[PDB]
Amino acid sequence: SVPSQKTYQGSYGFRLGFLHSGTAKSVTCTYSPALNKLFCQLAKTCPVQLWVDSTPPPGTRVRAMAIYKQSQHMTEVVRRCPHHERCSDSDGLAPPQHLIRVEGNLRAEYLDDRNTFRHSVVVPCEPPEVGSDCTTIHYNYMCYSSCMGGMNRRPILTIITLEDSSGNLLGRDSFEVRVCACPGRDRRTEEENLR
Ligand SMILES: [Zn+2]
C-alpha cells in the first residue's frame, strides 16, 4: 500500500505554512517554496505552521508520515538507518526507528501501523494562542537523507494529515524533505538547478 499525498484543504481549509529563514550557510532549517522542499540539519527544530480557515472540532489531530518520493521506492517503509536506530538518542517517547519526531509535546503519540508497518507521529490539533493566527508544530528528522542502509540518498516526502478523533481524513498537505549538513547551501543549489 501507499499513503495518498494528494493536497486536500477540506472543510476547515487546512494547509501548512513555513517560516522564511534564508539560505545563509549557518541556517539549520530552511524551506523552499519553489521546490516545495524543506532542507534541515539532523535532529534540528523544524517549525511547521498549521493554518485553518475555521476551527476543527475538539479531538482533531495532526499526523506526520514520511514516504519515499520516487514511485519505485514508495512501498518501502521510511525508517532510520541501521546506525541511527541504535544510537540511543531516545527522547523517551519516540521509538528509536522513527525518522520523524515531534519536539516538546508530551501528548505526541507514535504509531507503528499494524498493517503497513509505516511509522507516524500524531498530536492534538490546538487552537492558536492569543495574538497568534496559526499553531506551530516542531518536527525533528533523525537521519540524513544520505544515510546508508536507510534513506540512502533517496528523496522523501512528509505527509501531514488533519484527522478527526477516529483518524478519518479532514485535510492533507505535503512537502519534500532533505536532511543534510548544509541546508542553506543545498537549497541555493537545488533552486539554481531548477532555474
Ligand atoms: Zn541515519
Swiss-Prot record:
Outcome reported for the amino acid change (mutating residue 106 to F): In sporadic cancers; somatic mutation
Identify the coding gene.
TP53
Q: What is this protein called?
A: Cellular tumor antigen p53
Phenotype for residue 40 to G? In sporadic cancers; somatic mutation
Write down the position(s) of the site called Interaction with DNA. Answer: 25
- Per the record, what is the consequence of mutating residue 5 to R? In a sporadic cancer; somatic mutation
Q: What is the effect of changing residue 75 to M?
A: In sporadic cancers; somatic mutation
Boundaries of the shown chain within the full protein: 96 to 290 of 393
Effect upon mutating residue 99 to H: In sporadic cancers; somatic mutation
What would changing residue 114 to I do, according to UniProt? In sporadic cancers; somatic mutation
The impact of changing residue 176 to V is:
In an osteosarcoma with no family history; germline mutation and in sporadic cancers; somatic mutation
What effect on the protein does mutating residue 170 to Q have, as reported in its record?
A: In sporadic cancers; somatic mutation
Please describe, based on the UniProt annotation, the reported consequence of changing residue 41 to R: In sporadic cancers; somatic mutation
Q: What is the effect of changing residue 92 to C?
A: In sporadic cancers; somatic mutation
Task: Tell me the outcome of changing residue 48 to E.
Answer: In sporadic cancers; somatic mutation
